[PDB]
Design a protein around this ligand. Structure first.
Ligand SMILES: NCc1ccc(-c2cccs2)cc1
Ligand SMILES: [Yb+3]
Ligand SMILES: [Zn+2]
Length: 606
């Protein structure tokens, strides 16, 4: 059972379909309308059921054309309030009914960010975007807010006529609103059953450009051309992903490039992946994030974690496929380089949390834990590390990719646990059970800290990064002169990034060294967000006051939590910038993403 949801479990009843009919009110910052849930009983004599909600105003509940009794329970912190609905007629097993709920969201909905015109590129129109993963769908509409339940959906969304609505679904047409000629209704259909965390909505001044046979890029006009170029590898990655995972079942693969406050690198919303504009490096260098979102079209969206305790299933397999796509595009040596970088990121997380911390377990227990607080690189990189280790144990990438395809096939349209996965691994590799029995399952799955075994990694592309990092770390003042721009001559942006990641692991460095680095390498000039991020962290941790306004600027001018949280934490930990860090958060907090605002607040202890 799902300890993050207050709703009736799938063993009691199952939502089959949602029909959403709503209107987006920018003046009140509310979504208002009806959620018609088609619900199937899994039980004899079913007379009531419970749905998740969060900061919702319920107007009424209609079944068979009549209003019915319902009750909202006490709020249970981040989980919201359970909504019990009294059914007018007892249902037998497998009977289906339609429950129509009239509702309105709160302006403070944790699923939503409402932006004013000034927070947009165009400066003329406001903008709304949603982010339901993990348990924020309940903050938009009453539902069984659990990925153990999969449903199809259709929607009609009324918005001001000069704006465009898009959803995680196939666009099903647009018309003027019959009830308000200042408005348009956009329609949508998602024919593939999905967990509700994949329900997504954006409303804004969006334009589009085609970039492949099944891909449009959407953004405000100011970002269209840059995005089109940045993400032009999309079709090639789709074709590789299809070869590894099987048929792409979703119809279109569109991309939406959000305003800078989008809290993640990407969100695998079906038909319409959302991405941060921090990917717009100008050279396609951050395209692994596209490869990752693409991969989710199989691992996560087809095969889904049953509860959030098993999130590593989603993320581990996705990073595994992601790195295969990039290895196919750029070479096996590059896949190894990225894999080893991933291990470094895992070292960082474990170090940050502490090696005995419960969140460093692969499988976690989220009872009384807000998933947003628990979120880290761990399920991503410990999950990937397990798969990469198993790959090497079981005969290599070709063999293990056979397993991954059979795994996707086996569990498509289903929600599964770690035991489901492990059971199938044993079934698939039944001629290799002796080898599988060598794995320390208890440690890998259930123990905190770094994995019991580290995989083997080709070092070719990593060597120069480590070598240069070591030069700087071991350098004394009289060695600083020997550093020069030519040190970077043969390094890719990826290698520059890894050089910085290596050095950041030993931070602080002497202030004079960092000053010299800027002198000879001019890292302040680099706009690649991954590079600039690590460089600013290195500067602040090394107590360079000059970097304070740069770090403050990056932390606030975009809101990708990966960057904003550690930049804020670094700034707070530096005595010279502490007060300004706190003041800056205080001033920006009301106009930040609500989840980001909450977490930075916790991070800063304000
Ligand atoms: N992106 C929302 C989010 C999704 C998953 C999780 C976790 C599941 C298990 C450990 S963290 C946390 C936050
Ligand atoms: Yb010396
Ligand atoms: Zn992911």
């Amino acid at each position: 059972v799902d300890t993050c949801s207050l709703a009736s479990p799938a063993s009691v009843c199952r939502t089959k379909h949602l029909h959403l009919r709503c209107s987006v009110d920018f003046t009140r910052r509310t979504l208002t309308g009806t959620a018609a849930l088609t619900v199937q009983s899994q039980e004899d004599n079913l007379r009531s059921l419970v749905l998740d909600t969060k900061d919702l105003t319920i107007e009424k509940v209609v079944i068979n054309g009549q209003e019915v009794k319902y009750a909202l329970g006490e709020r249970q912190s981040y989980k919201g309030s359970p909504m019990e609905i009294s059914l007018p007629i007892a249902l037998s097993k497998n009977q289906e009914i339609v429950i129509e709920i009239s509702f309105e969201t709160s302006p403070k909905s944790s699923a939503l960010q409402w932006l004013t015109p000034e927070q947009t590129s165009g400066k003329e129109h406001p903008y709304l975007f949603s982010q339901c993963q993990a348990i924020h769908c309940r903050a938009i509409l009453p539902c069984q807010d659990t990925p153990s339940v999969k449903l199809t959906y259709t929607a009609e969304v009324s918005v001001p006529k000069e704006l465009v609505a898009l959803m995680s679904a196939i666009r099903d047409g647009e018309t003027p609103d019959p009830e308000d000629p200042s408005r348009k209704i956009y329609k949508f259909i998602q024919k593939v059953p999905i967990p509700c965390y994949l329900i997504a909505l954006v409303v804004g001044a969006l334009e589009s450009r085609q970039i492949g046979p099944r891909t449009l890029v959407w953004s405000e006009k100011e970002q269209v051309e840059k995005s089109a170029y940045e993400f032009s590898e999309t079709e090639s990655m789709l074709k590789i992903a299809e070869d590894l995972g099987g048929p792409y079942v979703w119809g279109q693969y569109d991309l939406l490039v959000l305003p800078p406050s989008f809290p993640y690198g990407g969100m695998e919303n079906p038909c319409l992946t959302f991405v941060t504009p921090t990917l717009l490096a100008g050279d396609k260098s951050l395209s692994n994030v596209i490869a990752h979102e693409i991969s989710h079209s199989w691992t996560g969206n087809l095969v889904t974690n049953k509860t959030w305790d098993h999130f590593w299933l989603n993320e581990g397999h996705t990073v595994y496929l992601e790195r295969h796509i990039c290895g196919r595009l750029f070479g096996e040596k590059f896949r190894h380089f990225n894999a080893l970088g991933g291990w470094g990121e895992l070292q960082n997380s474990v170090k940050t949390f502490g090696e005995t911390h419960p969140f460093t377990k692969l499988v976690v227990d989220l009872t009384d834990i807000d998933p947003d607080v628990a979120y880290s690189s761990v399920p991503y990189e410990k999950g990937f590390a397990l798969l990469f280790y198993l790959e090497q144990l079981l005969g290599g990438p070709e063999i293990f990719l056979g397993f991954l395809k059979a795994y996707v096939e086996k569990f498509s349209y289903k929600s599964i646990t770690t035991d489901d996965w492990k059971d199938f691994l044993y079934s698939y590799f039944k001629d290799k059970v002796d080898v599988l029995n060598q794995v320390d399952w208890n440690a890998w799955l259930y123990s905190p800290g770094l994995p019991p075994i580290k995989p083997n990694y080709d070092m070719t592309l990593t060597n120069a990064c480590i070598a240069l990092s070591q030069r700087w770390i071991t350098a004394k003042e009289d060695d600083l002169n020997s550093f020069n721009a030519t040190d970077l001559k043969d390094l890719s942006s990826h290698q520059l990034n890894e050089f910085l990641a290596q050095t950041l692991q030993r931070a602080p460095l002497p202030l004079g060294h960092i000053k010299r680095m800027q002198e000879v390498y001019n890292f302040n000039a680099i706009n690649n967000s991954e590079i600039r991020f690590r460089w600013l962290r290195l500067c602040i941790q090394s107590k360079w006051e000059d970097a304070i306004p740069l770090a403050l600027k990056m932390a606030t001018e975009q809101g990708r939590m990966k960057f904003t949280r550690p930049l804020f934490k670094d700034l707070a930990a530096f005595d010279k910038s502490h007060d300004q860090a706190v003041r800056t958060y205080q001033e920006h907090k009301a106009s930040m993403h609500p989840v980001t605002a909450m977490l930075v607040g916790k991070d800063l202890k304000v």
